[PDB]
C-alpha cells in the first residue's frame, strides 16, 4: 500500500487528504517522505508505539459505533482541517463542543460483545487561552477519563499559548485504548474531550510498515527493502538492514566469494614437440574440457585423453548440495524494530540501536567464518578426489608399472589403446602382463 503524501497515523486519524485510505487493509504500508499532515495540530504520546501496533494489524478498518452524547454539541470543526470548501475535522474523530450554556459531565459506556479486540482512538484538546477554554468547554477546568475493566487513563488539558501551526496556537493530544473481548469501555470527561466515532478491528498478521520513497513497479519479489525489492537467491546482502519477507542476512561485508570450482593451478609444462604427457602434480590440463579428472595415455599407438566421469561426479555432488545445507535457503521476518530514527530519545533509542548493531556484527562473523570454512573445505575435497583416483590406479596396476612421481605411472609393457581402456574402467588384470612387465623392469 502506497500511503503517498500520507502517514499511517494521518490516515488512521482521518485527515482530509488521506481519507482515501479509510477502511484500507494492507500487507506492508509504505510511508513516503513527501508525506505531510494538513489537519488540526496533534501530538501522539509514545507515537512510535501506536504507529507500530497499527502497522501490525494491517488494516484501518473503521466500525462506527452508535455513541450518544447528551446535552452537548457534536461534529465540531475548524479551518485548520478543511474538508473541501467548508471547514471540517478528523473523520474517525468527533469534536465535542458545549451545548447552549452548559457542558454536562459526559458519561457513556460501550461493551465489547464481539470476540475481537477493539481499538478506540480518542484525544484531549489543549486550549491556547482561558477564554477559549471557558467558551468552548464552559467550566475552565477540563478533564478526560477513559477507562476499561482492566486499565485506567485520565488526562488533564493544559491551557497555554504554543507554537503557531496552520493558524492555531492550540493542540490535540492523541490517546489510544484497546478493549479486549468481553471487557467494556467507559468515558467520563468533564470537557476538552475528543470522543471517537467507533473503533478499529485489530488483527494479528504479518502486516508491518517500512519507510521509503522507492518506486512501485509491477513484479513479484519475496524480499522488500527501502532500496527496492531484491533477489533472495544469496544467503546474505548489503543493501539495507531494514528488510521484509524472505531476505538474506544483512552482513557488513559487501562481498564474499565462495569457492564453487576446483582449486586451479594454471599454466602448463607443455613439454616440447613430443609431449611427455606428464602427470598433473604442478599443472592442470586446460585442454581437458570434458570433465574434472581424466587420464592421458602415451602408448606406442600415440597419445590420447579421456575423462573419468566417476571421480569427477563424486566431487561435483559433494560441492553442489553443501551450500544450501550450511546456510538456510531462507527465513522470514515481518514487523521488527525501527532500525532508524530522526531525533534523540535517550535510553530507549540507545538500546534499540545496540541490539540491531550487535546482531549484524555477530551475524557477519558467522558469514565470514563460514565462507572461509567452505572454500578451505572444498579445496581439500576436490584435491582429495584427484589423489584417490591416483591411488585407485596404484592398487590396480599393481606391479606392472611404477610411479614416476610426476603424477604418471610408467607401465613397463606394450600397452595398446584397448590395454589402456581396460585400466580406466578398472577391469584390467595384472597377471596378464605380469610376466612381460616384470622383465623390462629388472632387465
Amino acid at each position: 500500500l502506497d500511503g503517498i503524501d500520507c502517514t499511517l497515523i494521518d490516515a488512521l486519524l482521518g485527515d482530509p487528504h488521506c481519507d482515501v485510505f479509510q477502511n484500507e487493509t494492507w500487507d506492508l504500508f509504505v510511508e513516503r517522505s513527501k508525506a505531510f499532515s494538513n489537519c488540526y495540530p496533534y501530538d501522539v504520546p509514545d507515537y512510535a508505539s501506536l504507529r507500530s501496533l497499527v502497522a501490525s494489524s494491517g488494516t484501518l478498518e473503521f466500525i462506527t459505533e452508535g455513541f450518544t452524547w447528551t446535552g452537548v454539541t457534536q461534529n465540531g470543526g475548524s479551518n485548520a482541517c478543511k474538508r473541501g470548501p467548508g471547514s471540517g475535522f478528523f473523520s474517525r474523530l468527533n469534536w465535542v463542543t458545549k451545548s447552549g450554556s452548559t457542558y454536562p459531565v459526559l458519561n457513556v459506556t460501550m461493551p465489547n460483545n464481539d470476540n475481537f479486540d477493539k481499538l478506540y482512538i480518542w484525544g484531549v484538546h489543549h486550549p491556547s487561552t482561558n477564554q477559549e477554554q471557558t467558551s468552548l468547554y464552559v467550566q475552565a477546568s477540563g478533564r478526560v477519563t477513559v477507562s476499561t475493566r482492566r486499565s485506567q487513563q485520565t488526562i488533564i488539558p493544559n491551557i497555554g499559548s504554543r507554537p503557531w501551526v496552520r493558524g492555531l496556537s492550540s493542540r490535540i493530544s492523541i490517546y489510544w485504548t484497546i478493549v479486549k473481548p468481553g471487557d467494556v469501555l467507559v468515558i467520563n470527561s468533564n470537557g476538552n474531550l475528543i470522543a471517537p466515532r467507533g473503533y478499529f478491528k485489530m488483527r494479528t498478521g504479518k502486516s508491518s510498515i517500512m519507510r521509503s520513497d522507492a518506486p512501485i513497479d509491477t513484479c513479484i519479489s519475496e524480499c522488500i527493502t527501502p532500496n527496492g525489492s531484491i533477489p533472495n537467491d544469496k544467503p546474505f546482502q548489503n543493501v539495507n538492514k531494514i528488510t521484509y519477507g524472505a531476505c538474506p542476512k544483512y552482513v557488513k561485508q559487501n562481498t564474499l566469494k565462495l569457492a564453487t570450482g576446483m582449486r586451479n593451478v594454471p599454466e602448463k609444462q607443455t613439454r616440447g614437440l613430443f609431449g611427455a604427457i606428464a602427470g598433473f602434480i604442478e599443472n592442470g590440463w586446460e585442454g581437458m574440457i570434458d570433465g574434472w579428472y581424466g587420464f592421458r595415455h602415451q602408448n606406442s599407438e600415440g597419445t590420447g585423453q579421456a575423462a573419468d566421469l566417476k571421480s569427477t561426479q563424486a566431487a561435483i555432488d559433494q560441492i553442489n548440495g553443501k551450500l544450501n545445507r550450511v546456510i538456510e535457503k531462507t527465513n522470514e521476518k515481518f514487523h521488527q524494530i525501527e532500525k532508524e530514527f530522526s531525533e534523540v530519545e535517550g535510553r530507549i533509542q540507545d538500546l534499540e540501536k545496540y541490539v540491531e548493531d550487535t546482531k549484524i556484527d555477530l551475524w557477519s562473523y558467522n558469514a565470514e567464518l563460514l565462507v572461509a570454512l567452505e572454500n578451505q573445505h572444498t579445496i581439500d575435497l576436490t584435491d582429495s578426489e584427484m589423489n584417490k583416483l591416483f591411488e585407485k590406479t596404484r592398487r590396480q596396476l599393481r606391479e606392472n608399472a611404477e610411479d614416476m612421481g610426476n603424477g604418471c605411472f610408467k607401465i613397463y609393457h606394450k600397452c595398446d589403446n584397448a590395454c589402456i581402456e581396460s585400466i580406466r574402467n578398472g577391469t584390467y588384470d595384472h597377471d596378464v602382463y605380469r610376466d612381460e612387465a616384470l622383465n623390462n623392469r629388472f632387465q
Partner: antibody
Amino acid sequence: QVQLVQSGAEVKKPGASVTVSCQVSGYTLTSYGLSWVRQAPGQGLEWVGWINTYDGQTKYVKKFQGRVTMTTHTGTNTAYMEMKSLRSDDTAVYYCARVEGVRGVMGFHYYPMDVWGQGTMVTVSS
Amino acid sequence: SVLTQPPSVSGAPGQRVTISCTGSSSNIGAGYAVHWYQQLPGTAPKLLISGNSNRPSGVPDRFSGSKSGTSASLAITGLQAEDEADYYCQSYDSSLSGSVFGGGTKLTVLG
C-alpha cells in the same frame, strides 16, 4: 500552495561568480528533493545540478562539474546554487523545482519535476 | 545528447496533435519515467504530464502520455487557444549518469 522565492536577478562579468537562492513555502524542502535548470534565451532548457535535502547527496552535469555546486540551509528552508568562474555564454534564466527522489531512492529519475520557481536571471558579459 | 524532439507541431482547434520523442538505448531499454513540461510564452515551465501518463493536478485530461520501444509521445485533444506553448519531453538516462531533456517543440493553434 507551495511558493518558491528566487534571488533577485543578478549580473556579473565573466570570470566572476554568482549564487542563486531558492525559498520554499508549505512543504518543507527537507522532505523534498531539488534540482536546477538553465533557460538560455529561446534556447530550450538544460538540467544542471541536483541536491537532496536531509540527504546531502549531489550530482552535477559532466559539463560544469566543479564550476557549479549545491547548498542547502535546512534551517531557513532555502536552497543555494553556487557558480564560480562564470562564462559569458552561461548566462540565462535559472529555476528550482521539487523532486520526489528522496530518502531510499536517492536517484532523481523516478521523480517528475514539480512546482518550479519564478526564475532568476543572471547576465554574464565583459 | 538532447532527446530527439520535433522542431514544431501545429493543428486546428479541437484536434489531436502528437509530439514524438525518441531516445537512446540507454534511455530506451531503461524507459526511465518520462515526463513532459508545458512552458507557456514567457513563463516558468510546469509539469504537464508525469510518470508515463501520471496526471498532474489541475491539468485537463485531454493530455495523454504514451511510451513504447525506443520512444514515447504526448497526445493533445480538443486543442484550445491557450494550449499553444513550448513543450519539452523530459526524461532520465543512465549511460550519461544524468537526466536528458528534449530539444523542443512549438505548438501553435491554427487559425
